[PDB]
Amino acid sequence: SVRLSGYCGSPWRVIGYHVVVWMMAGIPLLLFRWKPLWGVRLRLRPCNLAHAETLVIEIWQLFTVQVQTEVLRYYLFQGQRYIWIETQQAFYQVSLLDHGRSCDDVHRSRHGLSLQDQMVRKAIYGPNVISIPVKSYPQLLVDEALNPYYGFQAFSIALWLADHYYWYALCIFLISSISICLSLYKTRKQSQTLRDMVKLSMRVCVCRPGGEEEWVDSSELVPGDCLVLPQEGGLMPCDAALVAGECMVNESSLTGESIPVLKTALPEGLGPYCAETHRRHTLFCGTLILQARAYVGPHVLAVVTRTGFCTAKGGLVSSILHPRPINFKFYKHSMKFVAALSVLALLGTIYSIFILYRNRVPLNEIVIRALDLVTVVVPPALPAAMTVCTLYAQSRLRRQGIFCIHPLRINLGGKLQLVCFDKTGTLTEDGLDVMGVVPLKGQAFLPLVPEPRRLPVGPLLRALATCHALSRLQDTPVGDPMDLKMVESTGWVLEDSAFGTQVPVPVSVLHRFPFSSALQRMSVVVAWPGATQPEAYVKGSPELVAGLCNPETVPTDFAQMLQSYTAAGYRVVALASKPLPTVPSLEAAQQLTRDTVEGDLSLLGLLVMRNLLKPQTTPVIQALRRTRIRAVMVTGDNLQTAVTVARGCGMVAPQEHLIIVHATHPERGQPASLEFLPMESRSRHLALSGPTFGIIVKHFPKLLPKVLVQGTVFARMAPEQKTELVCELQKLQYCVGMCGDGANDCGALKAADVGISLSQAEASVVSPFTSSMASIECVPMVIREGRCSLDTSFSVFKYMALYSLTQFISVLILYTINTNLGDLQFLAIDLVITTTVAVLMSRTGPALVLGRVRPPGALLSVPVLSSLLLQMVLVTGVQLGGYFLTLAQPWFVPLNRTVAAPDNLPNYENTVVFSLSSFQYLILAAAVSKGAPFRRPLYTNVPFLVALALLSSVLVGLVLVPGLLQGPLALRNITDTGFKLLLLGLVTLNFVGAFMLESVLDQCLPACLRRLRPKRASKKRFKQLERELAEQPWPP
Ligand SMILES: CC(C)CCC[C@@H](C)[C@H]1CC[C@H]2[C@@H]3CC=C4C[C@@H](OC(=O)CCC(=O)O)CC[C@]4(C)[C@H]3CC[C@]12C
């Protein structure tokens, strides 16, 4: 649901808003950007929608859109025009302006669009350009700089400059600049990807009315404008309908299917035009026209129906630009965790104020120093660390050959609990192998003919040779792999469309109804010289086609034979025919209605084909099942073939059970019924067809969750059924991933949390994730790298927390004795050590093998909190131990209490504390960087390892080598060498202790937690169902 809110312009209120929110404070701006409804209400008065000058959009999320004027006024929301419909006093999307006009209306527009009407319509529909705005670099800098985080960083810069800490201010500025530049790089790279995806600049001639023509730019097109297509072909600039002609088009960009598709002229009729119903008659935007020819007339004509963002390409681009929010929140209790850190920060700030009062510090300086302490705990480099983490993850995936359009989905990839796989072309090879054809002799099957070439010239051989959608492209047939192999098996050569016998008269294809996955069948109308009348051949699902055949033509053995070939793993389609009493000619034969042809056939035979499992499929499936990630197969193929492939690919290990759920339709006199018939060779899976799934969803919503939880093979699923299944699974709190290659999986890939399409280009739009490899190996890679990304982000957050608390502790310890860290010591710690380490942590790659244990989801969990508190206890212990150990030395000289830092620097206390803390930052970075089970070991990150080694060596030099940077850093020299070695020993003790503590926690904490407060259950619906089924299996 949506709603508008119009606010007519008023300058007095605007200036009042400006003065109030500028003079008062920035807090009103903060809460306005948090709650903008108040801001808009204050800025201007609600007004009549017709008089509206600004609109607020609720979908609640509030968006503000200016109502532009061009006599005609409109407004763009998410790239969608809405014009001012004067008669209805409302804003209707331009998508609906011409909607509903009949096919005959399109054929009337066929001739062209009047130039005056063209310019009248260009304003309404706008230029035919999917435009991704190209923001100027200053505009982007404004986009990022206005972040309140960078506002606080600028406040810190000012505060430190006021205190004469110039190097620290420079450090803050440099880190903020690095963060801003990394954000710029991220945004610019994403925008460049999209922009380069949706480039289009070409000149297309338009059949202007009156019979003449005109060469216009592709951006001048408007719905109803007439396209004349180039005979040799070219990129299609806008969605259109084929009024006249036939077109071969490559829809790979739009759907990822590289096989050329056949496009035909729109059929005249008094019914509404629809890009979905008439998809076969409509060219799409961004698809390549391989070659089109005109059956009648000098040139092929098409009529534009959708331009700009209205197009399907435009719809996908808009969905990318404004993605649906990710429902999962990766870092649970993030606010509560930052609050548990802020309580410590506030306690320390109060303690700092108390001590500074105790030391009799002037109130002008007490507030300044407490404010400085406040600025300490905000890490300048946190945004840079996060953005670098995401960039490294994306780069790793791209190097592996997997491209993600929304990098935020990478984290989701590691949270997958269920993966749905298309069977054909994803688990099994794209190619087929004709094992033979099973002809019929009356009402009984004959022995399999392994070589169809030897079939006598008759209905079956002509059906094999002719029932398909092949097209000769550059003297090479192209089309469905099944059609290619079927035709090749017969030896007939493609040359409407005619076929030449292998060596027996050539046969013409008068008319052809293409294959639709929803219909899961396909037919043609055929005639040859000497034919009394044309014959229509149908080729589709064996069980569906057998329904169209006359009951006396289908053998009583049909089910058993089809299962004999299907239960062996073959891919079977049936061929049926019926003589058409129409006179053989394109005139009548081209006017046939598909339904008139499909019904009342006469089964001819079964075409058995051998589709093989990909070599890489079984290892991947077994790896997925080893880590308790449910593997589900959603396919449109036969149920027995699907089950055999599942048993062969490890989705059903031999020991495990399998039960076929079969649902009977609610025929008259009885309701729908569920019957479970187990088939002999967690531990129990279910298999069910598509009609059975629909019956279960409609009539057994109570048992539907139990079917979904333990259902593994979903066969004979239509594309809408695949999308519905994905949605239903997601309703069980599953994190569903879908790995399908075909175009019939577009809906599932959109709906799935993680959608992967296998055979794609360097980049694409079809699905969130796209790969270049033909195997399903991308699924384990995506899951592994998503787990690595989650662990890396958690480790970076933990390190920044530890990094902050350590600096906080150091500064508190130094305040307690009336001194500070130092001008250049702050720079060193924040930039040379911490930024380097934080940006190098994330470069480490993912673990090579998936593991059963999932990455943690909560930042506030007892493990993480205990780790942080124990680490900080060790850090404070080490720093205070060093501080109290230096006081014990005979050569110790206490700092000058009276003068305050940086005046009292250098001194022994600051020197010792700085040395220990500087080592501790590297120690903590090494401690938090866990390798297993989600990442590679630390040492495989050669940049990060080298950074640690070099920084540690430099710090040891500072401690040991006299005079090294002891002036620039304001470090006091410690003549005693035994105490230097004692400081190094304390540092080594901390280095060992942090790692031992981390290991002890990560090993013995989960066991103690389980044995202490075991979880009664899990909020996940599917986990509840799993436990319930274990308690009581649903099928007895
Ligand atoms: C004062 C000194 C000691 C501070 C040193 C800081 C550097 C270690 C940091 C600052 C920003 C970091 C960069 C920020 C992010 C990236 C992006 C990354 O490159 C890509 O992601 C592109 C790959 C592709 O095309 O897919 C390489 C590392 C790099 C440049 C980082 C390398 C390390 C950098 C230069």
Ligand SMILES: CC(C)CCC[C@@H](C)[C@H]1CC[C@H]2[C@@H]3CC=C4C[C@@H](OC(=O)CCC(=O)O)CC[C@]4(C)[C@H]3CC[C@]12C
């Ligand atoms: C005070 C003086 C005497 C010492 C100053 C030391 C720093 C300037 C050095 C120590 C380690 C150096 C870092 C060591 C490793 C690298 C990795 C390098 O990036 C890569 O290695 C990416 C390579 C790839 O992607 O193939 C960026 C610079 C950086 C962080 C160096 C930046 C400068 C650092 C922090």
Ligand SMILES: Nc1ncnc2c1ncn2[C@@H]1O[C@H](COP(=O)(O)OP(=O)(O)O)[C@@H](O)[C@H]1O
């Ligand atoms: N060119 C074609 N013409 C007619 N039917 C086909 C063709 N190719 C495949 N089929 C049939 O369509 C049905 C469903 O196809 P689809 O939805 O793509 O799933 P899959 O092809 O993976 O089995 C299959 O059972 C198959 O027999």
Ligand code: ALF
């Ligand atoms: F195997 Al499929 F749609 F390609 F079910």
Ligand SMILES: [Mg+2]
């Ligand atoms: Mg497929």
Ligand SMILES: [Mg+2]
């Ligand atoms: Mg198919």
